[PDB]
Amino acid sequence: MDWRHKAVCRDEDPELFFPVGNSGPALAQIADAKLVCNRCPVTTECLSWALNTGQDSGVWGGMSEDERRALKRRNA
Ligand code: SF4
C-alpha cells in the first residue's frame, strides 16, 4: 500500500511538479494528475508536503501551489 500511495505520487503529472507555461492542455494534464493524486491514500510524503506548504490536508493527496493554479485555470 505504501509503495502504491507513492506509486501514484511519481505516476501523477509532471505538470503538477512543474508550473505550466503558455499551454492549455497543461491544465487538463495537470487536472488529471490532480484527481488521481488527490483521490489516492495518504503517505508520510503527503503529510510532510502539506506541512512544508502549510496546507490543511490529511485524507486527500498532496498538491503544490502551482498545481492549484493549473486547476483553477482548467475550470475557468
Ligand atoms: S495524494 Fe499524496 S501519497 Fe498520493 S500520490 Fe499524491 S502526493 Fe503521493
mmCIF file of N, CA and C and ligand atoms in Angstrom:
data_model
loop_
_atom_site.group_PDB
_atom_site.id
_atom_site.type_symbol
_atom_site.label_atom_id
_atom_site.label_comp_id
_atom_site.label_asym_id
_atom_site.label_seq_id
_atom_site.Cartn_x
_atom_site.Cartn_y
_atom_site.Cartn_z
ATOM 1 N N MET A 1 0.840 -1.225 0.000
ATOM 2 C CA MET A 1 0.000 0.000 0.000
ATOM 3 C C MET A 1 0.863 1.258 0.000
ATOM 4 N N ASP A 2 1.911 1.256 0.818
ATOM 5 C CA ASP A 2 2.808 2.401 0.912
ATOM 6 C C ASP A 2 3.420 2.730 -0.447
ATOM 7 N N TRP A 3 3.941 1.709 -1.122
ATOM 8 C CA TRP A 3 4.553 1.904 -2.432
ATOM 9 C C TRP A 3 3.501 2.305 -3.457
ATOM 10 N N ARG A 4 2.269 1.850 -3.245
ATOM 11 C CA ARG A 4 1.170 2.174 -4.145
ATOM 12 C C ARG A 4 0.786 3.643 -4.006
ATOM 13 N N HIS A 5 0.762 4.123 -2.767
ATOM 14 C CA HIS A 5 0.417 5.511 -2.497
ATOM 15 C C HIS A 5 1.453 6.441 -3.126
ATOM 16 N N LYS A 6 2.704 6.000 -3.128
ATOM 17 C CA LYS A 6 3.755 6.808 -3.712
ATOM 18 C C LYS A 6 3.920 6.401 -5.168
ATOM 19 N N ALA A 7 3.168 5.373 -5.545
ATOM 20 C CA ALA A 7 3.159 4.903 -6.913
ATOM 21 C C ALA A 7 2.472 5.956 -7.735
ATOM 22 N N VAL A 8 1.350 6.431 -7.200
ATOM 23 C CA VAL A 8 0.605 7.477 -7.848
ATOM 24 C C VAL A 8 1.331 8.799 -7.612
ATOM 25 N N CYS A 9 2.185 8.837 -6.568
ATOM 26 C CA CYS A 9 2.993 10.032 -6.302
ATOM 27 C C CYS A 9 3.724 10.430 -7.579
ATOM 28 N N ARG A 10 4.716 9.616 -7.943
ATOM 29 C CA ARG A 10 5.522 9.858 -9.144
ATOM 30 C C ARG A 10 4.738 9.622 -10.439
ATOM 31 N N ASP A 11 3.678 8.828 -10.356
ATOM 32 C CA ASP A 11 2.869 8.495 -11.532
ATOM 33 C C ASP A 11 1.820 9.560 -11.854
ATOM 34 N N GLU A 12 1.899 10.717 -11.204
ATOM 35 C CA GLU A 12 0.938 11.778 -11.448
ATOM 36 C C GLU A 12 1.338 12.558 -12.704
ATOM 37 N N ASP A 13 1.167 13.875 -12.694
ATOM 38 C CA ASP A 13 1.509 14.685 -13.858
ATOM 39 C C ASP A 13 2.713 15.570 -13.564
ATOM 40 N N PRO A 14 3.785 15.467 -14.372
ATOM 41 C CA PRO A 14 4.975 16.292 -14.186
ATOM 42 C C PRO A 14 4.600 17.766 -14.122
ATOM 43 N N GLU A 15 3.454 18.091 -14.715
ATOM 44 C CA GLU A 15 2.953 19.453 -14.719
ATOM 45 C C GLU A 15 2.529 19.875 -13.308
ATOM 46 N N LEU A 16 2.286 18.893 -12.435
ATOM 47 C CA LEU A 16 1.904 19.180 -11.049
ATOM 48 C C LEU A 16 3.133 19.564 -10.238
ATOM 49 N N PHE A 17 4.293 19.089 -10.681
ATOM 50 C CA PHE A 17 5.550 19.406 -10.020
ATOM 51 C C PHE A 17 6.257 20.548 -10.749
ATOM 52 N N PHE A 18 5.747 20.906 -11.930
ATOM 53 C CA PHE A 18 6.331 21.984 -12.719
ATOM 54 C C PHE A 18 5.247 22.953 -13.191
ATOM 55 N N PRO A 19 5.418 24.262 -12.927
ATOM 56 C CA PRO A 19 4.439 25.277 -13.333
ATOM 57 C C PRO A 19 4.228 25.302 -14.844
ATOM 58 N N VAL A 20 2.968 25.362 -15.266
ATOM 59 C CA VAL A 20 2.638 25.397 -16.682
ATOM 60 C C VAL A 20 3.173 26.660 -17.340
ATOM 61 N N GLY A 21 3.420 26.574 -18.640
ATOM 62 C CA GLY A 21 3.921 27.717 -19.371
ATOM 63 C C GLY A 21 2.803 28.523 -20.003
ATOM 64 N N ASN A 22 2.583 28.315 -21.296
ATOM 65 C CA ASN A 22 1.541 29.035 -22.018
ATOM 66 C C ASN A 22 0.554 28.081 -22.690
ATOM 67 N N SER A 23 0.531 26.814 -22.268
ATOM 68 C CA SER A 23 -0.364 25.845 -22.885
ATOM 69 C C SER A 23 -1.626 25.618 -22.067
ATOM 70 N N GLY A 24 -2.672 25.180 -22.758
ATOM 71 C CA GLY A 24 -3.931 24.878 -22.109
ATOM 72 C C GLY A 24 -3.991 23.429 -21.677
ATOM 73 N N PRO A 25 -3.568 22.501 -22.554
ATOM 74 C CA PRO A 25 -3.535 21.077 -22.245
ATOM 75 C C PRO A 25 -2.850 20.812 -20.922
ATOM 76 N N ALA A 26 -1.953 21.706 -20.533
ATOM 77 C CA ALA A 26 -1.230 21.533 -19.279
ATOM 78 C C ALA A 26 -2.201 21.497 -18.116
ATOM 79 N N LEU A 27 -3.264 22.266 -18.237
ATOM 80 C CA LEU A 27 -4.286 22.318 -17.205
ATOM 81 C C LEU A 27 -5.054 21.017 -17.177
ATOM 82 N N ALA A 28 -5.363 20.509 -18.357
ATOM 83 C CA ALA A 28 -6.080 19.255 -18.463
ATOM 84 C C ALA A 28 -5.179 18.120 -18.020
ATOM 85 N N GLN A 29 -3.896 18.268 -18.319
ATOM 86 C CA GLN A 29 -2.909 17.260 -17.955
ATOM 87 C C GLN A 29 -2.725 17.271 -16.446
ATOM 88 N N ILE A 30 -2.505 18.472 -15.932
ATOM 89 C CA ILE A 30 -2.364 18.686 -14.517
ATOM 90 C C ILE A 30 -3.621 18.274 -13.766
ATOM 91 N N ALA A 31 -4.755 18.614 -14.337
ATOM 92 C CA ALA A 31 -6.040 18.309 -13.735
ATOM 93 C C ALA A 31 -6.215 16.810 -13.578
ATOM 94 N N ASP A 32 -5.623 16.056 -14.490
ATOM 95 C CA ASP A 32 -5.757 14.609 -14.463
ATOM 96 C C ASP A 32 -4.972 14.052 -13.308
ATOM 97 N N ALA A 33 -3.780 14.582 -13.134
ATOM 98 C CA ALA A 33 -2.939 14.155 -12.042
ATOM 99 C C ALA A 33 -3.555 14.603 -10.727
ATOM 100 N N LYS A 34 -4.188 15.772 -10.755
ATOM 101 C CA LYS A 34 -4.832 16.330 -9.573
ATOM 102 C C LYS A 34 -5.913 15.396 -9.026
ATOM 103 N N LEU A 35 -6.755 14.851 -9.907
ATOM 104 C CA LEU A 35 -7.832 13.962 -9.464
ATOM 105 C C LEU A 35 -7.289 12.617 -9.015
ATOM 106 N N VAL A 36 -6.366 12.085 -9.795
ATOM 107 C CA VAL A 36 -5.765 10.788 -9.493
ATOM 108 C C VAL A 36 -4.866 10.850 -8.254
ATOM 109 N N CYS A 37 -4.169 11.968 -8.089
ATOM 110 C CA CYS A 37 -3.260 12.164 -6.957
ATOM 111 C C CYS A 37 -4.015 12.565 -5.689
ATOM 112 N N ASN A 38 -5.152 13.231 -5.860
ATOM 113 C CA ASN A 38 -5.951 13.681 -4.722
ATOM 114 C C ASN A 38 -6.825 12.568 -4.147
ATOM 115 N N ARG A 39 -7.251 11.631 -4.990
ATOM 116 C CA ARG A 39 -8.105 10.538 -4.527
ATOM 117 C C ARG A 39 -7.286 9.364 -3.989
ATOM 118 N N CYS A 40 -5.967 9.437 -4.137
ATOM 119 C CA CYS A 40 -5.084 8.386 -3.644
ATOM 120 C C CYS A 40 -4.917 8.492 -2.127
ATOM 121 N N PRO A 41 -4.644 7.360 -1.453
ATOM 122 C CA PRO A 41 -4.451 7.327 0.003
ATOM 123 C C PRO A 41 -3.443 8.370 0.484
ATOM 124 N N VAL A 42 -3.053 8.280 1.754
ATOM 125 C CA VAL A 42 -2.108 9.233 2.330
ATOM 126 C C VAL A 42 -0.801 8.568 2.761
ATOM 127 N N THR A 43 0.295 9.308 2.610
ATOM 128 C CA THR A 43 1.625 8.827 2.985
ATOM 129 C C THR A 43 2.383 9.877 3.769
ATOM 130 N N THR A 44 3.512 9.473 4.337
ATOM 131 C CA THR A 44 4.351 10.396 5.075
ATOM 132 C C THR A 44 4.744 11.555 4.166
ATOM 133 N N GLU A 45 4.806 11.276 2.860
ATOM 134 C CA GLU A 45 5.155 12.299 1.880
ATOM 135 C C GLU A 45 4.046 13.334 1.778
ATOM 136 N N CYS A 46 2.811 12.859 1.886
ATOM 137 C CA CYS A 46 1.643 13.721 1.799
ATOM 138 C C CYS A 46 1.556 14.660 3.001
ATOM 139 N N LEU A 47 1.771 14.116 4.197
ATOM 140 C CA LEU A 47 1.721 14.920 5.416
ATOM 141 C C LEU A 47 2.886 15.900 5.461
ATOM 142 N N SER A 48 4.078 15.392 5.177
ATOM 143 C CA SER A 48 5.283 16.213 5.187
ATOM 144 C C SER A 48 5.190 17.334 4.161
ATOM 145 N N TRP A 49 4.544 17.040 3.044
ATOM 146 C CA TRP A 49 4.380 18.018 1.975
ATOM 147 C C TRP A 49 3.447 19.143 2.411
ATOM 148 N N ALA A 50 2.327 18.768 3.019
ATOM 149 C CA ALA A 50 1.349 19.742 3.490
ATOM 150 C C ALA A 50 1.967 20.683 4.517
ATOM 151 N N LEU A 51 2.826 20.136 5.371
ATOM 152 C CA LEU A 51 3.485 20.930 6.401
ATOM 153 C C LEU A 51 4.492 21.891 5.785
ATOM 154 N N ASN A 52 5.112 21.456 4.698
ATOM 155 C CA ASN A 52 6.102 22.269 4.001
ATOM 156 C C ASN A 52 5.438 23.435 3.279
ATOM 157 N N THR A 53 4.205 23.222 2.846
ATOM 158 C CA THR A 53 3.455 24.251 2.136
ATOM 159 C C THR A 53 2.394 24.888 3.031
ATOM 160 N N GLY A 54 2.277 24.387 4.257
ATOM 161 C CA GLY A 54 1.306 24.929 5.190
ATOM 162 C C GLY A 54 -0.126 24.740 4.724
ATOM 163 N N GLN A 55 -0.380 23.649 4.009
ATOM 164 C CA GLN A 55 -1.722 23.366 3.508
ATOM 165 C C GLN A 55 -2.470 22.428 4.450
ATOM 166 N N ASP A 56 -3.724 22.764 4.738
ATOM 167 C CA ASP A 56 -4.549 21.952 5.624
ATOM 168 C C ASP A 56 -5.087 20.726 4.892
ATOM 169 N N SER A 57 -4.454 19.579 5.118
ATOM 170 C CA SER A 57 -4.872 18.338 4.478
ATOM 171 C C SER A 57 -4.446 17.128 5.303
ATOM 172 N N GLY A 58 -5.040 15.977 5.007
ATOM 173 C CA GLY A 58 -4.709 14.763 5.728
ATOM 174 C C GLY A 58 -5.241 13.519 5.044
ATOM 175 N N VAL A 59 -6.498 13.574 4.616
ATOM 176 C CA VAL A 59 -7.126 12.445 3.942
ATOM 177 C C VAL A 59 -6.937 12.532 2.431
ATOM 178 N N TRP A 60 -6.799 13.752 1.923
ATOM 179 C CA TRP A 60 -6.612 13.970 0.494
ATOM 180 C C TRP A 60 -5.147 13.792 0.103
ATOM 181 N N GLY A 61 -4.851 14.011 -1.174
ATOM 182 C CA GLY A 61 -3.489 13.870 -1.654
ATOM 183 C C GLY A 61 -2.700 15.161 -1.556
ATOM 184 N N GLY A 62 -1.428 15.104 -1.937
ATOM 185 C CA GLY A 62 -0.585 16.283 -1.884
ATOM 186 C C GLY A 62 -0.621 17.074 -3.175
ATOM 187 N N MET A 63 -0.714 18.394 -3.059
ATOM 188 C CA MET A 63 -0.763 19.258 -4.232
ATOM 189 C C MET A 63 0.031 20.544 -4.007
ATOM 190 N N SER A 64 0.790 20.949 -5.024
ATOM 191 C CA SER A 64 1.588 22.158 -4.955
ATOM 192 C C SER A 64 0.741 23.376 -5.290
ATOM 193 N N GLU A 65 1.267 24.544 -4.969
ATOM 194 C CA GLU A 65 0.570 25.796 -5.237
ATOM 195 C C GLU A 65 0.402 26.001 -6.739
ATOM 196 N N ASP A 66 1.456 25.706 -7.492
ATOM 197 C CA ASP A 66 1.412 25.847 -8.942
ATOM 198 C C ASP A 66 0.363 24.912 -9.521
ATOM 199 N N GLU A 67 0.219 23.761 -8.881
ATOM 200 C CA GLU A 67 -0.749 22.763 -9.302
ATOM 201 C C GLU A 67 -2.164 23.313 -9.165
ATOM 202 N N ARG A 68 -2.431 23.979 -8.043
ATOM 203 C CA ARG A 68 -3.747 24.560 -7.806
ATOM 204 C C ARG A 68 -4.056 25.601 -8.878
ATOM 205 N N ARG A 69 -3.021 26.323 -9.305
ATOM 206 C CA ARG A 69 -3.177 27.336 -10.344
ATOM 207 C C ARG A 69 -3.652 26.683 -11.638
ATOM 208 N N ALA A 70 -3.045 25.548 -11.966
ATOM 209 C CA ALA A 70 -3.400 24.800 -13.165
ATOM 210 C C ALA A 70 -4.851 24.341 -13.109
ATOM 211 N N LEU A 71 -5.309 24.047 -11.900
ATOM 212 C CA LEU A 71 -6.674 23.575 -11.676
ATOM 213 C C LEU A 71 -7.697 24.695 -11.846
ATOM 214 N N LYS A 72 -7.424 25.853 -11.251
ATOM 215 C CA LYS A 72 -8.344 26.982 -11.338
ATOM 216 C C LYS A 72 -8.501 27.446 -12.778
ATOM 217 N N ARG A 73 -7.410 27.396 -13.523
ATOM 218 C CA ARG A 73 -7.424 27.802 -14.921
ATOM 219 C C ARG A 73 -8.178 26.781 -15.766
ATOM 220 N N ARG A 74 -8.073 25.513 -15.379
ATOM 221 C CA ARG A 74 -8.747 24.436 -16.095
ATOM 222 C C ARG A 74 -10.260 24.607 -16.014
ATOM 223 N N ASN A 75 -10.748 24.948 -14.825
ATOM 224 C CA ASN A 75 -12.177 25.143 -14.613
ATOM 225 C C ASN A 75 -12.655 26.432 -15.277
ATOM 226 N N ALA A 76 -11.787 27.437 -15.297
ATOM 227 C CA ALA A 76 -12.120 28.721 -15.901
ATOM 228 C C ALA A 76 -13.315 29.362 -15.206
HETATM 229 S S1 SF4 B 1 -2.009 12.036 -2.924
HETATM 230 FE FE1 SF4 B 1 -0.176 12.112 -1.609
HETATM 231 S S2 SF4 B 1 0.513 9.939 -1.465
HETATM 232 FE FE2 SF4 B 1 -0.947 10.042 -3.184
HETATM 233 S S3 SF4 B 1 0.455 10.410 -4.993
HETATM 234 FE FE3 SF4 B 1 -0.357 12.421 -4.372
HETATM 235 S S4 SF4 B 1 1.310 13.119 -3.047
HETATM 236 FE FE4 SF4 B 1 1.664 10.869 -3.168
#
